[PDB]
Design a protein around this nucleic acid. Structure first.
Lengths: 99, 88, 22, 82, 65, 149, 213
RNA sequence: UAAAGUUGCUGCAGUUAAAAAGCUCGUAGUUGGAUCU
RNA sequence: CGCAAGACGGACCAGAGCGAAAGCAUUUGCCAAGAAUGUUUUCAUUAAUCAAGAACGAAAGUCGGAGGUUCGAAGACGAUCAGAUACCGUCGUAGUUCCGACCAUAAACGAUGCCGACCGGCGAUGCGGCGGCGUUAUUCCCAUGACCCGCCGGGCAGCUUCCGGGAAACCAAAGUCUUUGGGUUCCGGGGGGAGUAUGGUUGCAAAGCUGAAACUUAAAGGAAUUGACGGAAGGGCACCACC
């Protein structure tokens, strides 16, 4: 029986969606089916920030960030706990977690 | 381009943006218009200039996206090309 | 048994039969 | 709902409708007498003209065809008929 | 906890009426559209009504996304 | 919907209820006939003639001023084309698609569209042959089509 | 009303409505409340036709009066904005109040402690009073509701179009309904103003009572 | 033979139980808008 | 720091668009199309669906020609393992790329034929058109762009609903069905044997289309429920758990 009305993807109004490679396993997954994360993280950790800022030759240099796009397949996204199973009623919910 | 007296005299070779800036500038509910021109200055220096721009959300806009239509993108790219050629 | 492997076995059987009846 | 009078629609509701889904279909277009200060005669222009109309007594553009209603050149007085 | 004594004591407590009604005052603001609605009802000649001006713009929808 | 497309468009002319010459229109029936004759001599099809009569002369509908349709007027005067306007335009489009296809032979979409256009051409030709507008021997070919254009 | 000039709307009533913001609806409009709205404002707010408000209030008062046992009318309020108004209405008119949470099964479960069989049901907000309304569909219970522009009209038999969000408007509507019901009953006259005033039916924030003490 | 509306014209089914052709075009076939006392 | 080759067009990229489907994403130009909207233009029934027949049809595969970066059936090793003819790793042939000729198959899926009518609501979004406060750019006026608020028409969808339906899951279609008839094509008849044998046809092949019977069997199966289980996730408890 059908688990999802959208079949776990966003392929409405077309026939084919180009595939992408999973960042974890390199599996081929449709771009609209893959789970997409955009991580904008400081290039230095919150531990190394103190030493790096103390040793900087500038004043208020503001460290650059790191913008990484991750395209997990369903298996890898479930294993990495990026998404998890939900109840049959709660599956329909589409608002992102508040974080 | 030359070295004299323990002194290296550099010349302009190119320009670029840091990866952080370009990565930050690409957001997900707007279009990125990109143009490029191969243009020679009045002293034989033939450069290739790349221009990038992004459509701007209005301050009273309620629509999530700010997409320009394809003809609008083409007009913007032609304007980019002509302005860069004029300025170079 | 997976249905596609049953199909593959049937196709190999058909090829062996084609070799049988030339 | 459940009691809408389909024989006597209000004029605002009927003007809101598509021109074919009205009780009796009527066009949204019209004809205008247009007059230019540099002309001594009027002409009749369709509101949705598909051609470039020229002044009868001059050589100036009168209206430019567009997707829908034509663009009447500024300075020309236009009045709807009927 | 619910006994009749509490009910009567609370109805005594809520037996509070202000000196001046919070409703009717000297001047009440009314928008032009509700002014037209009142003039349709033949109550548009009331002098307690001050015709305020409507919102300058049309920004009442929260941004989507 | 559309004959050869999945579209279900509704856009079309919505005629007014009245079948009378409009008040603003001072042109007499013979004047409209003369204007139609001049436009046809200029080499314009009934669709184009009606368009420029509506757009510049205030003639909302020639049938309601003259009592006759434009194509019938042209036939009565005798300056109507041999083959009908819609069939001629379909044949012209098919010729253009075929001329494109000879220099672009990998355009499978062009081949599909040419098949659709030729099906429309054959349907219109069959209709006109039943109505005796076209001779019963008239057939559409892949070589003589450009001659008819 | 019925074009009876004794039942026509008064200048004082119009001023009370305009002061309480009764005519001011919401930014959303239920398709079944279209007939009660005059026009939308320049800021997306829907204006409620107060003539239709008075007409529906008089119809609701007529429905309430045609129950010769006043306790057979149940007045319900789950929101705090209408609990005091409902209690005041029940005290003045003789109805039975349910102020607070409505226990499901009150109308349907014969065994329950709060089981009752009213003959008519009046609620402050069909959205916030959806539980009694649904139970009204189980025991042949006619329903009166104070409905905003976006109120859902399912199981609502007499819908009074009014602002039911503000405390002032809710209190004023309940006070006006009690006044109309009493006037139709015979007690209190239609000539001089009622000795009670809307501010008794209002709701005050606990900070307001602290300020008043 | 009825039961069998499990041969369905009356009168069956074809998302997931068996099942809509991968997709259009297309001749025969079937079907075909208003209107004339 | 350059140079060469081949492949591919990230981020922008969306339950967005276009195409009959397969499918389609760097710029610019040329070429022929196309839907929708607008239309007081033209014809005047020219239409719907369709045996036969025809075009197109992912990937893989097959012939020739070019190329040959990456990846990579087969294969060679290295590991892991009781064993691994696999999963993992290093290489690596065909292939992957383009041209021409074949092949015509996919969970080719919305597992849902097409055309037409009627039947609730709501907010979005794409294209076109219409109307309107107000903001912004083209230094200032209108036009037009970008917004804002509505309306109309087709479109991809979504939410909601005791429309109605259904075995239910669910579906505004899978509704308007014992109150059973709008038109038409394809197609199913318990499970296996079996999409097999055989004949025919198509193909260079691989195979494609059409396609049984003997025999066997009381069930296969659909949806949902309660348990039990999980080398599924999340919580909670305990010195017969730990710190």
């Amino acid at each position: 029986t059908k688990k999802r009305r959208n079949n776990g993807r966003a392929k409405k109004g077309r026939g084919h969606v180009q595939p992408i490679r999973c960042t974890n396993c390199a599996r081929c997954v449709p771009k609209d089916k893959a789970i997409k994360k955009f991580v904008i993280r400081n290039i230095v950790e919150a531990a190394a920030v103190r030493d790096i800022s103390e040793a900087s030759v500038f004043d208020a240099y503001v460290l650059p960030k790191l913008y990484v796009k991750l395209h997990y397949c369903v298996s890898c996204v479930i294993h990495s706990k990026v998404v998890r199973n939900r109840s049959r009623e709660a599956r329909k919910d589409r608002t992102p977690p508040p974080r | 381009e030359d070295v004299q007296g323990k002194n290296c005299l550099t010349n302009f070779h190119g320009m670029d943006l840091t990866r952080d800036k370009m990565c930050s500038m690409v957001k997900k509910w707007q279009t990125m218009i990109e143009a490029h021109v191969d243009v020679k200055t009045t002293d034989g220096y033939l450069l290739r200039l790349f221009c990038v721009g992004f459509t701007k959300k209005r301050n009273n806009q309620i629509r999530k996206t700010s997409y320009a239509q394809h003809q609008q993108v083409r007009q913007i790219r032609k304007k980019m090309m002509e302005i860069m050629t004029r300025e170079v | 048994m997976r249905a596609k492997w049953r199909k593959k076995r049937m196709r190999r059987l058909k090829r062996k039969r084609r070799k049988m009846r030339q | 709902p459940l009691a809408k009078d389909l024989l006597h629609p209000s004029p605002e509701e009927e003007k809101r409708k598509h021109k074919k889904k009205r009780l009796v279909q009527s066009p949204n277009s019209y004809f205008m007498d247009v007059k230019c200060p540099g002309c001594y005669k009027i002409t009749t222009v369709f509101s949705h003209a598909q051609t470039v109309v020229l002044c009868v007594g001059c050589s100036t553009v009168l209206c430019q065809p567009t997707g829908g209603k034509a663009r009447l050149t500024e300075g020309c007085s236009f009045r709807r008929k009927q | 906890i619910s006994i009749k004594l509490q009910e009567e004591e609370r109805e005594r407590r809520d037996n509070y009426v202000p000196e001046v009604s919070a409703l009717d005052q000297e001047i009440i603001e009314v928008d032009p559209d509700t002014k037209e609605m009142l003039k349709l009802l033949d109550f548009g000649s009331l002098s307690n009504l001050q015709v305020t001006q409507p919102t300058v713009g049309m920004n009442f929808k929260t941004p989507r996304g | 919907g559309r004959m050869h497309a999945p579209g279900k468009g509704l856009s079309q002319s919505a005629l007014p209820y009245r079948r009378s010459v409009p008040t603003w229109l001072k042109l007499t029936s013979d004047d409209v006939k003369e204007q139609i004759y001049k436009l046809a001599k200029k080499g314009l099809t009934p669709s184009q003639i009606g368009v420029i009569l509506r757009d510049s002369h205030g003639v909302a509908q020639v049938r309601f001023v003259t009592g006759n349709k434009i194509l019938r007027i042209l036939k009565s005067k005798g300056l109507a084309p041999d083959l009908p306007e819609d069939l001629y335009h379909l044949i012209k489009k098919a010729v253009a698609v075929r001329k494109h296809l000879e220099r672009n032979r990998k355009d499978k979409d062009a081949k599909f569209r040419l098949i659709l256009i030729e099906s429309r051409i054959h349907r219109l030709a069959r209709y006109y042959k039943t109505k005796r507008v076209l001779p019963p021997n008239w057939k559409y070919e892949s070589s003589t089509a450009s001659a008819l254009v | 009303s019925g074009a009876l000039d004794v039942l026509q709307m008064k200048e004082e009533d119009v001023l009370k409505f305009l002061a309480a913001g009764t005519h001011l609806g919401g930014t959303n409009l239920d398709f079944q409340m279209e007939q009660y709205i005059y026009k939308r404002k320049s800021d997306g707010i829907y204006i409620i036709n107060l003539k239709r408000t008075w007409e529906k209030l008089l119809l609701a008062a007529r429905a309430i009066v045609a129950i010769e046992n006043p306790a057979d009318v149940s007045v319900i309020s789950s929101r705090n904005t209408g609990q005091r108004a409902v209690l005041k209405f029940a005290a003045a008119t003789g109805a039975t109040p349910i102020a607070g949470r409505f226990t499901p099964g009150t109308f349907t479960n014969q065994i329950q402690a709060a089981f009752r069989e009213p003959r008519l049901l009046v609620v402050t907000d069909p959205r916030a009073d959806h539980q009694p309304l649904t139970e009204a569909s189980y025991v042949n219970l006619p329903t009166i509701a104070l409905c905003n522009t976006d109120s859902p009209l399912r199981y609502v038999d007499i819908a009074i179009p009014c602002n039911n969000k503000g405390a002032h408007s809710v209190g004023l509507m309940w006070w006006m309904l009690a006044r109309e019901v009493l006037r139709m009953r015979g007690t209190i006259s239609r000539e001089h103003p009622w000795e009670v005033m809307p501010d008794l039916y209002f709701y005050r924030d606990p900070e307001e009572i602290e300020k008043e003490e």
